[PDB]
Design a protein around this nucleic acid. Structure first.
Ligand code: MG
Ligand code: MG
Ligand code: MG
Ligand code: MG
Ligand code: MG
Ligand code: MG
Ligand code: MG
Ligand code: MG
Ligand code: MG
Ligand code: MG
Lengths: 127, 114, 96, 98, 206, 151, 79
RNA sequence: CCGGCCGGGAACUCAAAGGAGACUGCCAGUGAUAAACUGGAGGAAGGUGGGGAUGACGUCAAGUCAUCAUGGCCCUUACGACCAGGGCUACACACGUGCUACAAUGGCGCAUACAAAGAGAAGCGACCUCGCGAGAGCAAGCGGACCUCAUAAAGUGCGUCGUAGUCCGGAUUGGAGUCUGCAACUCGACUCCAUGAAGUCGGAAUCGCUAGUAAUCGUGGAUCAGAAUGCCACGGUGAAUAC
């Protein structure tokens, strides 16, 4: 059966489907490259296969919407370690130590009346 | 490489060079390398005189340089003469187009003094 | 805020639909690629306060012409004076 | 075959004319493609709080609006008498057609 | 001048809303004012009817108008009369037609507005502002109220120089959102100025 | 830091060489939050340093850096009226937190046409410690040690 | 510079200029209409253009055409 | 028709209602066997997780009689009311707040990936066609997770520019227009063609911010016929530093 992991991170949300096969990676019907493999953090989408091997062992067709270049590559990265669910929980311990398991809960903080932007405070002079 | 104006430009890419003229600003330039049929990133090296005088005629078409300055100055003088607001302002050395003068008029007012 | 200044604003809405919207529509088409017998525009000799763009937009209760809102038809002053007594459905101090 | 759009500003309520409408259907004729949630549009009105000066003060109010779908597939002349005449809920808005 | 309106900050929880109706922008305008018009006319009319709080709702092309009072039989008149002459012109104002509901006010000494109104009504009758506050406060601790406080403001009695002077007895956590707190407002238009009353009545939690 | 002492956030050991050290470097040189175009200039300048030194990458950075590192530094100190420049032996972790800060700072203040270029020439001057930044090491030791007295 | 499709002028002013043309120029000619686009059919006439306190005489001429009447009647006195 | 597009599918994304979850509670170190802190565990979230709302009694006769209310005071064929035109937009200057720059971490051309949150019938306006353009004519869908505003920009590509008051910067002004509106002279906003100031990083002095923050990049909204570098909101990329 399709052995799944969701994952998401800041405004993005990627869904990662697993199925032992090759070393090929689909996303939004794209090559790892044709989406952003050749931009900042191609290596990080693959990352969730470091202490846990692949090189051509298991397949992964995915999608993901919302956010941006690195939010989407963060969402997916989460989903992969989430899908490594199915392949026991033995592997999902050095995935903790990896950090990849956690949901990066850091959100864009609101623009709050009185300020210029969240923290940014209107420069003032006394006189 | 002289052309149209007293100006004697050239020695880098063409469209850019042409702008030198007082009357061509990127658009009038693109439009002439196209209305004379010439490469537009080409220097004057390889650029025959034969080509240069074809362009010289194209620019001849519009009021560039000296004529432009005079015509453009006539236009401003006409203003003043009529004794209208846009002119009364030209003679008083202040912004024509309404810009505030309570502050920051500087450009059309000459560096501040007293 | 000054009856008179209110009154003004009422006659303005009155005429605003008597002539304009109605009889003034004769300028939309009366000024489109339909060429000319220039009597076409000339006719803008009507009450002046007949135009809608002449209407200010005043706090329905107090007349204040500033700090108004189309939702509540009130000045931000009254909007709140009511908001804090329910008064405005669904409306409450929000955060996020 | 017939869906009823539903909206009100109070939530602990709209889903009470929802689960009333839905109920007053399955019991009768029946069918109803469940009650769908659907994007709750939230207006936000933020205004100055002082009668004069102090642009940094201000109150920030909102108006949440909630939607519910319905969708009933089998229009039983009975369930028609079950929508009608078995209804009310003053602060809710119902749209029969689309 | 830095307290959040106690009623308002509750709403979401523990406090209601004196209009429930729904409308969508286009009419939200003309609706809001209509409401003002009714609460206006009805408060001048039922002035001496000890009315504590008037609720409005328009259910499809209709306006209901509920009226919380502590003298129902005054609002209602001879076997239904006054309600009519009201309902009549209340539906006249809103245009759309109008029923009308007279909810009885149980133990009015607990209703903020009806407290304030009294203190007001008295200051204009010309009574010792200190006394009235203190009377008010008791009749409430008397009938349960797990706390209350009233304050007045300015030219209290006469003083060219204006004062406030409150009076808290019991508990009044204007910070606990759970806390049932009935807060309202009444001004007294005196011969020497305008005195403003705020009563808080603490009723419990959850 | 009145009471709330802290640790130190850690960053992601560099998308090419696997070093945290460089990851701070790139950040340092980074601007207006452009990581996309940050390392771009750092790698290209580490590429000109790469073969223009031969020595390689890892080790050529290490030495050029090895120079601009300061051992001691003075620290303001407003006591009995006067400001009292007090010397203090500075920690390893920062010892090069500057070194990088100065190296990056030294290169923007430079004639070369591009940033890859500018940065490159700074590292290189430093390699043979004779650049702007290495001078900032010199004038820092020269500042303390004059306060040699205070200790 | 605006207007595009049908240049503008107040009726009372325009018919105050035919009350001259076919009739011969009277004294200066008073309008407050500082908006009105000047027409050839005004050249040689003198229009008194309001500016706040009074009307400034302005001899219309073979080139004040496109312009407005307000253009020749300063409103803010600065010495 | 290779378009979730049609059957269907109820998984997943999400949508919005209702739930559980984090308690210093668990091991340990510290500390008086206390409070607490520190580190570790597990865990999406560890030590009030992140943010907001909430602002005690009180201080400044602090601000508001012009939001409204209101004691007193004064005008009343004028201190009221109506109309046109002007003025609040003036301009030797000074100070505060900001926007745009001085440029190759950039400018430019072409190709091209990825948001969020709002808005809407006297409205959002597609499509087509016309115009270099701003816009225009014609016309669909859309009271709207459906339709429209609406092609996010930073980014990545190639290429060009090569450190120059420049292919940086765009003021200023001439010329010609567009849209709104009775009406764009005073004073509207945009456009096309020319024009191309100051400005090469800013004395004394001074301000912001401790994390998805600063910095930078676009996006919408209230007001609003028209009029945002302001204000209020949105996400993109994403630091440095605290002895
Ligand atoms: Mg941000
Ligand atoms: Mg200045
Ligand atoms: Mg009044
Ligand atoms: Mg207006
Ligand atoms: Mg004052
Ligand atoms: Mg009064
Ligand atoms: Mg003004
Ligand atoms: Mg340029
Ligand atoms: Mg700069
Ligand atoms: Mg802080």
């Amino acid at each position: 059966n399709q052995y799944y992991g969701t994952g998401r991170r800041k405004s993005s949300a990627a869904r990662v489907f697993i199925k032992p096969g090759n070393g090929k990676i689909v996303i939004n019907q794209r090559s790892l490259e044709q989406y952003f493999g050749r931009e900042t953090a191609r290596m990080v989408v693959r990352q969730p296969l470091e202490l846990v091997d692949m090189v051509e062992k298991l397949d992964l067709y995915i999608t993901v919407k919302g956010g941006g270049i690195s939010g989407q590559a963060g969402a997916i990265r989460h989903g992969i370690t989430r899908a490594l669910m199915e392949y026991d929980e033995s592997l999902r311990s050095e995935l903790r130590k990896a950090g990849f398991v956690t949901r990066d809960a850091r959100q864009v903080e609101r623009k709050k009346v009185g300020l210029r932007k969240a923290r940014r405070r209107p420069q003032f002079s006394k006189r | 490489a002289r052309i149209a104006g007293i100006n004697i430009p050239d020695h880098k890419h063409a469209v850019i060079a042409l702008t030198s003229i007082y009357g061509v600003g990127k658009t009038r330039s693109k439009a002439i390398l196209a209305a004379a049929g010439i490469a537009e990133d080409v220097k004057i090296s390889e650029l025959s005189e034969g080509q240069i005088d074809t362009l010289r005629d194209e620019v001849a078409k519009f009021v560039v340089e000296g004529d432009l300055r005079r015509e453009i100055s006539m236009s401003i003088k006409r203003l003043m003469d009529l004794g209208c607001y846009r002119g009364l302002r030209h003679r008083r050395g202040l912004p024509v187009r309404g810009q505030r003068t309570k502050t920051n008029a500087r450009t059309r007012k000459g560096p501040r003094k007293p | 805020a000054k009856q008179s200044m209110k009154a003004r604003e009422v006659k303005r809405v009155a005429l605003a639909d008597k002539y304009f919207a109605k009889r003034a529509e004769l300028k939309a088409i009366i000024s489109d690629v339909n060429a000319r017998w220039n009597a076409v525009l000339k006719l803008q000799t009507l009450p002046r306060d007949s135009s809608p763009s002449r209407q200010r937009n005043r706090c329905r209760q107090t007349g204040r012409p500033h700090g108004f809102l189309r939702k509540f038809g009130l000045s931000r002053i009254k909007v709140r004076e009511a908001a804090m007594r329910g008064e405005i459905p669904g409306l409450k101090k929000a955060s996020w | 075959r017939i869906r009823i759009r539903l909206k009100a500003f109070d939530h602990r309520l709209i889903d009470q004319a929802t689960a009333e409408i839905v109920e007053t259907a399955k019991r009768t004729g029946a069918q109803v493609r469940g009650p769908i949630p659907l994007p709750t549009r939230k207006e936000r009105f933020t205004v100055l709080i002082s009668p004069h000066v102090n642009k940094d003060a201000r109150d920030q109010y909102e108006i949440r609006t909630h939607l519910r779908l319905v969708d009933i597939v089998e229009p039983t002349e009975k369930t028609v008498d079950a929508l009608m005449r078995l209804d009310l809920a003053a602060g809710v808005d119902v749209q029969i057609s689309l | 001048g830095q307290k959040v309106h106690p009623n308002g900050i509750r709403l979401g929880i523990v406090k209601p809303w004196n209009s429930t109706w729904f409308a969508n922008t286009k009419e939200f305008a003309d609706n809001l004012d209509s409401d003002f018009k009714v609460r206006q006319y009805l408060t001048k009319e039922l002035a001496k009817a000890s009315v504590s709080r008037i609720v409005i709702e328009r259910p499809a092309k209709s306006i209901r108008v509920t009226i919380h009072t502590a003298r129902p039989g005054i609002v209602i008149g001879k076997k239904g009369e006054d309600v009519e002459k009201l309902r009549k012109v209340v539906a006249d104002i809103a245009g759309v037609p109008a029923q009308i509901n007279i909810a009885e006010v149980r133990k009015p000494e607990l209703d903020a507005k009806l407290v304030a109104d009294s203190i007001t009504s008295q200051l204009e009758r010309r009574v010792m502002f200190r006394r009235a506050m203190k009377r008010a406060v008791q009749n409430a601790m008397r009938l349960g109220a797990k706390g209350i406080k009233v304050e007045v403001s300015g030219r209290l009695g006469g003083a060219e120089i204006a004062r406030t002077e409150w009076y808290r007895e019991g508990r009044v956590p204007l910070h606990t959102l759970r806390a049932d707190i009935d807060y309202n407002t009444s001004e007294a238009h005196t011969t020497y100025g305008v005195i403003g009353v705020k009563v808080w009545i603490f009723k419990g939690e959850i | 830091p009145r009471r709330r002492v802290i640790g130190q956030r850690k960053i992601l050991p560099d998308p090419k060489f696997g070093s945290e050290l460089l990851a701070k470097f790139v950040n340092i040189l980074m601007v207006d939050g452009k990581k996309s175009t940050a390392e771009s200039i750092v790698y290209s300048a580490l590429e000109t340093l790469a073969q223009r030194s031969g020595k390689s990458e890892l080790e050529a950075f290490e030495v050029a850096l090895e120079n601009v590192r300061p051992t001691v530094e003075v620290k303001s100190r407003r006591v009995g009226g006067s400001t009292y420049q007090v010397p203090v032996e500075v920690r390893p972790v920062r010892r090069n937190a500057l070194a990088m800060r100065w190296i990056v700072e030294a290169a923007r203040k430079r004639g070369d046409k591009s940033m890859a270029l500018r940065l490159a020439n700074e590292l290189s001057d430093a390699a043979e410690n004779k650049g702007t930044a290495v001078k900032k090491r010199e004038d820092v030791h020269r500042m303390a040690e004059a306060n040699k007295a205070f200790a | 510079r605006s207007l595009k499709k049908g240049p503008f002028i107040d009726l009372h002013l325009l018919k105050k200029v035919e009350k001259a043309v076919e009739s011969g120029d009277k004294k200066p000619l008073r309008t407050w209409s500082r908006r009105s686009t000047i027409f050839p059919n005004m050249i040689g006439l003198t229009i008194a253009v309001h500016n706040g306190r009074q009307h400034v005489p302005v001899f219309v001429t073979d080139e004040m055409v496109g312009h407005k009447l307000g253009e020749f009647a300063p409103t803010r006195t600065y010495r």
